[PDB]
Amino acid sequence: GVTQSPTHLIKTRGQQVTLRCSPKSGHDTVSWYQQALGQGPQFIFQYYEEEERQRGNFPDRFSGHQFPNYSSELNVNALLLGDSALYLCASSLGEGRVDGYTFGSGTRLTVVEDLRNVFPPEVAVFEPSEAEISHTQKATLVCLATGFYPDHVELSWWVNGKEVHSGVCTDPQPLKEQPALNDSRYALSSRLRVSATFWQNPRNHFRCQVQFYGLSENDEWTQDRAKPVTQIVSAEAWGRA
Amino acid sequence: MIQRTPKIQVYSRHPAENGKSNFLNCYVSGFHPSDIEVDLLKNGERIEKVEHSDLSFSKDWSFYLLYYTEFTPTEKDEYACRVNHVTLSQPKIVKWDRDM
Amino acid sequence: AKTTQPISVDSYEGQEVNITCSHNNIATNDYITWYQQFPSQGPRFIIQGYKTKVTNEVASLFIPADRKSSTLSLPRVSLSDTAVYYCLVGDMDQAGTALIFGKGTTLSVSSDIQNPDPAVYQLRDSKKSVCLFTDFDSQTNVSQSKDSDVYITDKCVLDMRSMDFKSNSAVAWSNKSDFACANAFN
Amino acid sequence: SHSMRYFYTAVSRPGRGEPRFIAVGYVDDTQFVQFDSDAASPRGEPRAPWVEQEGPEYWDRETQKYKRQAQTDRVNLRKLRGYYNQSEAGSHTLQRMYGCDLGPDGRLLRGYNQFAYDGKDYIALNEDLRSWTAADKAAQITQRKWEAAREAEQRRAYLEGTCVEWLRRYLENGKKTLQRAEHPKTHVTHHPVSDHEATLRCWALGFYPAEITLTWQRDGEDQTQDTELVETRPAGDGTFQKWAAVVVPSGEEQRYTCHVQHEGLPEPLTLRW
Amino acid sequence: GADGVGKSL
Ligand SMILES: [Mg+2]
Ligand SMILES: [Mg+2]
């Protein structure tokens, strides 16, 4: 398919950025889109044979490049907070429709006012209610990832070292801890439900795992709290007889 | 040090109508440092008794000031704003255009 | 041309879902195409057509004779069809206009819970207090917290596949020492 | 939302002795107070009717604060000269901005207190109102001094307490003007530019508060790339003005709509020529 | 109402 790089990225206001896309094998045309929260993808431009062939409603600070091997760059300078978006690349054949249009999964770019706006998640797991177990013979574990910014998290459950999906449900969107703040930190919850017997076996190991995409090695951290780098944060529990 | 050149807008409080009292504004913003000289001109001549707002500044720390005087516009009178600042080799003069 | 479509469509598992799209200004060199966007993914092709009904393994596409509208039909939806659906009118001419998206239609899919047994449970930290509202019916609406100190999530459905069992739940929590689960979701 | 914000400017003056200190305070886009150290008998001075009613104790206490502040900025400008190994021959500028935002619920949303030296960030109180961010190694000296003096706790007490209570008092005593948005008066003008082109200019006048959005659309598509916007500017009577202009082919004017978003408007506005 | 006076820089 289409390869887009990086999957996530944080920049501060005024910085510049280069996003990259390789088209699907057999495709030689690349179209870039900007998709802000709650909106549809907005067309930026389309490249074929190393040249910009058409452009949407975007200023020149948005520039592009296509190499001989058909891979492409989206370069944006003088970033604004409102440039935060999912940036999508779609590839196709010869500026036509006959081989389809295939989209990558996008680069999530968040532009923040200051590096100190970035916070990692705290992760805690809460063990199942004895009242639930008695009444239903099922046992729900709950995971909470809280205090993070921006919304650059992927949460997964792992049972005895293997990822599980059955019995799992994660909030489709996070809560704003302070809804009136434009840069509020976020909270996200997830649940894993298993049979009471499975929870009651102390051999079973349960982990809620949160991948956070934060600051890079190159970002200069001055604050006393830990640098909020890209990191994996987890909380866990063994079963209880 | 850090220096920022002044942006200048000249305009009237109300849409101009010839022969009707109005206020002539010269809004200077985005400059640094704060020392600045602003004159309003009528037919190339400095208007007297021009007042100005109190010094304030924006998020980016650059200053802004409003200079203003009452005037009754006419068909032939030409009005302008003359600004001097360390960032300006020569004074910048911006003519009043009632369509702007 | 250009497309307009509903903001949202609600549904239950197992029903047929139809999403209609309006495009009055479609031209002879325009085709119709639909894409779905799942959470954390790029848009994905579903189906395309010109004037005749189209059926594939994912959907059917209905196009009336004047081509001024079209209807995407999803045959027996499941939870995993929850996505945003985009109807696009595309230029058929090579090197013509790129694919332009309108606003999409958000499709929700609920499960008809058998033997609902709504209850609120208190859970304890493995190493802190969380309340769990679970097993309620899908018509239940979970109100957001009126207090700044209490956090209440929206509802989410989980599927315990090996048990043929589905259940809705929502979570509430607070750092306050007066916080009671009994009335958290009231 | 609502906010109270204070803006301090201190400027040294080689040879003219004491630096000039000027302070202005705002609620939202409305100035209410001024202090200028170069004035005949320096005093806090009202700039809005809803503090002119405040009695002499209020104004005496404000004046006493400004006078002490101006004395401290003289010391501050001298220390900064030492920190940056700068001469006495040049003029330098110390700025401070601080204040509080109230949420839509009337509760404290965010406090701030930050400083700049010669136009660049120097030190800022972080949003936790407990720790500092220094912009350079000179400001790191100030940070260590302020951590030792627990300066942040002093500022937090004002920002969380007094600042919010003053803002509430002002919002109530001036509710007729501070809590009543004045909608923009709008119209479109037309100026030929060539045989086949004409400028359409969308005007918004007399609105309060200053926040506004003006857009031109052709066929429902924003013409952002070819629209000239001026900065929002003060009318001089407490209201604001802005316009947006687009160059248009003679004959296609009916294809353009101007769209106005402002909080004094029940619905967004659409205008044409 | 203004803030009081704190520590010198
Ligand atoms: Mg902030
Ligand atoms: Mg099943």
CSV table of C-alpha atoms in Angstrom, one decimal, chain D:
chain,number,residue,atom,x,y,z
D,1,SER,CA,-14.8,33.7,28.5
D,2,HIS,CA,-13.6,36.9,30.0
D,3,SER,CA,-10.1,38.1,31.1
D,4,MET,CA,-8.3,40.8,33.0
D,5,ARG,CA,-4.8,41.7,31.8
D,6,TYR,CA,-2.1,44.1,32.9
D,7,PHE,CA,0.6,45.4,30.6
D,8,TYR,CA,3.8,47.0,32.1
D,9,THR,CA,6.5,48.7,30.0
D,10,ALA,CA,9.7,50.1,31.6
D,11,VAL,CA,12.3,51.8,29.5
D,12,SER,CA,15.7,53.0,30.6
D,13,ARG,CA,16.8,56.5,29.5
D,14,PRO,CA,20.6,57.1,29.4
D,15,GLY,CA,21.2,60.5,31.0
D,16,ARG,CA,17.6,61.4,31.8
D,17,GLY,CA,17.9,59.5,35.1
D,18,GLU,CA,14.9,57.4,36.2
D,19,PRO,CA,13.3,55.0,33.6
D,20,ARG,CA,9.8,55.6,32.3
D,21,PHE,CA,7.2,53.2,33.7
D,22,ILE,CA,3.8,52.8,32.0
D,23,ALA,CA,1.1,50.4,33.1
D,24,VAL,CA,-2.3,49.8,31.4
D,25,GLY,CA,-5.0,47.3,32.5
D,26,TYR,CA,-7.8,45.8,30.4
D,27,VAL,CA,-10.9,43.7,30.9
D,28,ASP,CA,-11.4,41.9,27.6
D,29,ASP,CA,-10.8,44.6,24.9
D,30,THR,CA,-11.7,47.5,27.2
D,31,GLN,CA,-8.9,49.5,28.9
D,32,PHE,CA,-9.8,50.7,32.4
D,33,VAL,CA,-6.6,52.1,34.0
D,34,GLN,CA,-3.4,53.9,33.1
D,35,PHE,CA,-0.3,54.8,35.1
D,36,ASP,CA,2.6,56.8,33.7
D,37,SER,CA,5.7,57.6,35.8
D,38,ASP,CA,6.5,60.8,33.7
D,39,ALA,CA,3.2,62.4,34.6
D,40,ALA,CA,3.1,65.6,36.8
D,41,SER,CA,2.0,63.8,40.0
D,42,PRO,CA,2.0,60.0,39.0
D,43,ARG,CA,-1.4,58.4,39.8
D,44,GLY,CA,-3.5,55.5,38.7
D,45,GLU,CA,-6.0,57.0,36.3
D,46,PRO,CA,-9.4,55.7,35.2
D,47,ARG,CA,-10.1,54.9,31.6
D,48,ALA,CA,-13.6,53.3,31.8
D,49,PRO,CA,-16.7,54.5,33.6
D,50,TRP,CA,-17.1,51.3,35.7
D,51,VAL,CA,-14.0,52.2,37.7
D,52,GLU,CA,-14.5,55.9,37.9
D,53,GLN,CA,-17.1,55.2,40.5
D,54,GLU,CA,-14.5,53.5,42.7
D,55,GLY,CA,-13.6,55.6,45.7
D,56,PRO,CA,-10.4,57.2,46.8
D,57,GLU,CA,-9.2,54.2,48.9
D,58,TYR,CA,-9.3,52.1,45.8
D,59,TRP,CA,-7.3,54.6,43.8
D,60,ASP,CA,-4.8,55.3,46.6
D,61,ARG,CA,-4.0,51.6,46.9
D,62,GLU,CA,-3.6,51.2,43.1
D,63,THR,CA,-1.4,54.2,43.0
D,64,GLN,CA,0.8,52.9,45.8
D,65,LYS,CA,1.3,49.6,44.0
D,66,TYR,CA,2.2,51.4,40.7
D,67,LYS,CA,4.7,53.6,42.5
D,68,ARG,CA,6.4,50.7,44.2
D,69,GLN,CA,6.4,48.7,40.9
D,70,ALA,CA,8.1,51.6,39.1
D,71,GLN,CA,10.8,51.7,41.8
D,72,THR,CA,11.4,48.0,41.4
D,73,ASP,CA,11.7,48.2,37.6
D,74,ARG,CA,14.6,50.7,37.9
D,75,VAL,CA,16.4,48.1,40.0
D,76,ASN,CA,15.3,45.4,37.4
D,77,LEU,CA,16.7,47.3,34.4
D,78,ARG,CA,20.0,47.8,36.2
D,79,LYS,CA,20.3,44.1,37.1
D,80,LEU,CA,19.5,43.1,33.5
D,81,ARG,CA,22.3,45.4,32.3
D,82,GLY,CA,24.7,43.4,34.6
D,83,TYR,CA,23.3,40.1,33.4
D,84,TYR,CA,23.9,40.8,29.7
D,85,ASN,CA,27.1,42.8,30.2
D,86,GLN,CA,25.5,45.8,28.6
D,87,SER,CA,26.6,49.5,28.7
D,88,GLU,CA,24.8,52.4,30.3
D,89,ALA,CA,24.8,54.3,27.0
D,90,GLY,CA,21.9,52.4,25.4
D,91,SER,CA,18.2,52.3,26.2
D,92,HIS,CA,16.5,49.0,27.2
D,93,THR,CA,13.0,47.8,27.7
D,94,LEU,CA,11.5,45.5,30.3
D,95,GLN,CA,7.9,44.3,29.7
D,96,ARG,CA,5.5,42.3,31.8
D,97,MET,CA,2.1,40.9,31.0
D,98,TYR,CA,-0.1,39.1,33.6
D,99,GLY,CA,-3.7,38.4,34.3
D,100,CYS,CA,-6.4,35.8,34.6
D,101,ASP,CA,-9.0,34.1,32.4
D,102,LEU,CA,-12.5,33.2,33.8
D,103,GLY,CA,-14.2,30.2,32.3
D,104,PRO,CA,-17.8,30.2,30.8
D,105,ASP,CA,-18.7,29.0,34.4
D,106,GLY,CA,-17.2,32.1,36.1
D,107,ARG,CA,-14.3,30.1,37.5
D,108,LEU,CA,-10.6,30.7,37.0
D,109,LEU,CA,-9.5,29.1,33.8
D,110,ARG,CA,-5.9,30.1,33.3
D,111,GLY,CA,-3.4,32.6,35.0
D,112,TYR,CA,-0.3,34.1,33.4
D,113,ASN,CA,2.7,36.2,34.3
D,114,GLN,CA,5.5,36.6,31.9
D,115,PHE,CA,8.4,39.0,31.1
D,116,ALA,CA,10.4,40.1,28.0
D,117,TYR,CA,13.7,42.0,27.8
D,118,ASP,CA,14.4,44.1,24.7
D,119,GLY,CA,11.5,42.5,22.9
D,120,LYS,CA,12.3,38.8,23.5
D,121,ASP,CA,10.9,36.3,26.0
D,122,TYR,CA,12.8,36.4,29.3
D,123,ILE,CA,10.9,34.3,31.9
D,124,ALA,CA,7.4,33.0,32.1
D,125,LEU,CA,5.3,31.5,34.9
D,126,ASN,CA,4.1,28.1,33.8
D,127,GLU,CA,0.4,27.3,33.6
D,128,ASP,CA,0.7,25.3,36.9
D,129,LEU,CA,1.5,28.7,38.5
D,130,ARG,CA,4.2,26.9,40.4
D,131,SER,CA,7.3,26.7,38.1
D,132,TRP,CA,9.1,28.9,35.6
D,133,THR,CA,10.4,28.7,32.1
D,134,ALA,CA,13.6,30.8,31.5
D,135,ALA,CA,14.5,31.7,27.9
D,136,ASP,CA,18.3,31.9,28.5
D,137,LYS,CA,21.1,31.7,31.0
D,138,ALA,CA,20.5,35.2,32.3
D,139,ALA,CA,16.9,34.4,33.0
D,140,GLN,CA,18.1,31.2,34.7
D,141,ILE,CA,19.7,33.4,37.3
D,142,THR,CA,16.3,35.1,37.9
D,143,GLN,CA,14.6,31.7,38.0
D,144,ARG,CA,16.9,30.4,40.8
D,145,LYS,CA,16.4,33.7,42.7
D,146,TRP,CA,12.6,33.3,42.3
D,147,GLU,CA,12.5,29.6,43.3
D,148,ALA,CA,14.4,30.5,46.5
D,149,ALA,CA,12.1,33.4,47.2
D,150,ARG,CA,9.0,31.3,46.4
D,151,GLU,CA,7.9,34.1,44.0
D,152,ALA,CA,5.5,31.7,42.2
D,153,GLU,CA,3.4,31.2,45.4
D,154,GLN,CA,3.1,35.0,45.8
D,155,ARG,CA,1.9,35.3,42.2
D,156,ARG,CA,-0.4,32.3,42.4
D,157,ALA,CA,-2.2,33.8,45.3
D,158,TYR,CA,-3.0,36.9,43.3
D,159,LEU,CA,-3.8,35.1,40.1
D,160,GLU,CA,-6.1,32.6,41.7
D,161,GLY,CA,-7.6,34.9,44.2
D,162,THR,CA,-7.5,38.7,43.9
D,163,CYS,CA,-7.3,38.7,40.1
D,164,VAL,CA,-10.4,36.7,39.7
D,165,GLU,CA,-12.4,38.6,42.3
D,166,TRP,CA,-11.5,42.0,40.7
D,167,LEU,CA,-12.5,40.6,37.3
D,168,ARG,CA,-15.9,39.5,38.7
D,169,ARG,CA,-16.5,42.9,40.4
D,170,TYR,CA,-15.7,44.7,37.1
D,171,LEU,CA,-17.8,42.4,35.0
D,172,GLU,CA,-20.8,43.1,37.2
D,173,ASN,CA,-20.3,46.8,37.7
D,174,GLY,CA,-19.7,47.2,33.9
D,175,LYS,CA,-22.1,44.5,32.7
D,176,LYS,CA,-24.0,47.0,30.4
D,177,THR,CA,-20.9,47.3,28.2
D,178,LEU,CA,-18.5,44.4,29.1
D,179,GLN,CA,-21.2,41.7,28.8
D,180,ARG,CA,-23.2,43.0,25.8
D,181,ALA,CA,-21.6,42.3,22.4
D,182,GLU,CA,-22.0,45.0,19.8
D,183,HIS,CA,-22.7,43.4,16.4
D,184,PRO,CA,-20.8,44.7,13.4
D,185,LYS,CA,-22.4,47.0,10.9
D,186,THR,CA,-21.6,45.5,7.5
D,187,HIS,CA,-21.7,46.6,3.8
D,188,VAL,CA,-19.8,45.9,0.6
D,189,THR,CA,-18.2,48.6,-1.6
D,190,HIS,CA,-17.2,48.3,-5.3
D,191,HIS,CA,-14.2,50.0,-7.0
D,192,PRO,CA,-13.2,49.4,-10.6
D,193,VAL,CA,-9.5,48.4,-11.1
D,194,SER,CA,-9.3,47.8,-14.8
D,195,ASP,CA,-11.6,47.3,-17.8
D,196,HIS,CA,-12.4,43.7,-16.7
D,197,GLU,CA,-11.7,43.8,-12.9
D,198,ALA,CA,-13.2,45.4,-9.8
D,199,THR,CA,-12.4,45.3,-6.1
D,200,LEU,CA,-15.2,44.1,-3.8
D,201,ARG,CA,-14.5,45.2,-0.2
D,202,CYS,CA,-16.5,43.8,2.7
D,203,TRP,CA,-16.6,46.2,5.7
D,204,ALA,CA,-17.3,45.5,9.4
D,205,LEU,CA,-17.6,48.5,11.6
D,206,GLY,CA,-18.5,49.4,15.2
D,207,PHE,CA,-18.2,45.9,16.6
D,208,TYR,CA,-17.2,44.8,20.2
D,209,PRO,CA,-15.3,42.7,21.2
D,210,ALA,CA,-12.5,42.7,18.6
D,211,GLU,CA,-12.6,39.0,17.6
D,212,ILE,CA,-14.1,38.7,14.1
D,213,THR,CA,-13.9,36.5,11.0
D,214,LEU,CA,-14.4,37.9,7.5
D,215,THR,CA,-14.3,35.7,4.5
D,216,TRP,CA,-15.0,35.9,0.8
D,217,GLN,CA,-16.4,32.9,-1.0
D,218,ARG,CA,-16.9,32.3,-4.8
D,219,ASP,CA,-19.4,29.5,-5.5
D,220,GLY,CA,-19.3,28.6,-1.8
D,221,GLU,CA,-15.5,28.0,-1.9
D,222,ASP,CA,-13.3,30.3,0.3
D,223,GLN,CA,-11.1,32.7,-1.8
D,224,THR,CA,-8.6,32.8,1.0
D,225,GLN,CA,-5.5,32.9,-1.2
D,226,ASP,CA,-6.7,36.0,-3.1
D,227,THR,CA,-8.3,37.9,-0.3
D,228,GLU,CA,-6.6,41.0,1.3
D,229,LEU,CA,-7.3,41.4,5.0
D,230,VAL,CA,-6.3,44.4,7.1
D,231,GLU,CA,-5.6,43.9,10.8
D,232,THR,CA,-8.5,44.5,13.1
D,233,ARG,CA,-8.2,48.1,14.2
D,234,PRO,CA,-9.7,50.4,16.8
D,235,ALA,CA,-12.4,52.9,15.8
D,236,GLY,CA,-11.4,55.2,18.7
D,237,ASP,CA,-14.8,55.1,20.4
D,238,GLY,CA,-14.2,51.6,22.0
D,239,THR,CA,-15.3,49.6,18.9
D,240,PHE,CA,-13.3,48.0,16.1
D,241,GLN,CA,-13.2,47.8,12.3
D,242,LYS,CA,-12.0,45.3,9.7
D,243,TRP,CA,-12.4,44.7,6.0
D,244,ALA,CA,-11.6,42.1,3.4
D,245,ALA,CA,-11.2,42.7,-0.3
D,246,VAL,CA,-11.1,40.5,-3.4
D,247,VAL,CA,-10.4,41.5,-7.0
D,248,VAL,CA,-13.2,40.2,-9.3
D,249,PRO,CA,-13.9,40.0,-13.0
D,250,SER,CA,-16.4,42.6,-14.2
D,251,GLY,CA,-19.6,40.5,-14.5
D,252,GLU,CA,-19.0,37.8,-11.9
D,253,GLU,CA,-19.8,40.0,-8.8
D,254,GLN,CA,-23.0,38.1,-8.2
D,255,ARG,CA,-20.8,35.0,-7.7
D,256,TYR,CA,-19.1,36.3,-4.5
D,257,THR,CA,-20.5,36.3,-0.9
D,258,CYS,CA,-18.9,37.8,2.2
D,259,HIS,CA,-19.3,35.9,5.4
D,260,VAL,CA,-19.1,37.6,8.9
D,261,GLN,CA,-18.7,35.7,12.2
D,262,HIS,CA,-19.0,37.7,15.4
D,263,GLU,CA,-20.3,37.0,18.8
D,264,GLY,CA,-22.8,39.9,18.6
D,265,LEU,CA,-24.4,38.2,15.6
D,266,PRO,CA,-27.1,35.5,16.3
D,267,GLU,CA,-26.2,33.8,13.1
D,268,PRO,CA,-23.3,34.2,10.7
D,269,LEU,CA,-23.9,36.8,8.1
D,270,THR,CA,-23.8,36.6,4.3
D,271,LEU,CA,-23.5,39.7,2.2
D,272,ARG,CA,-23.1,40.5,-1.5
D,273,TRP,CA,-22.9,43.5,-3.8
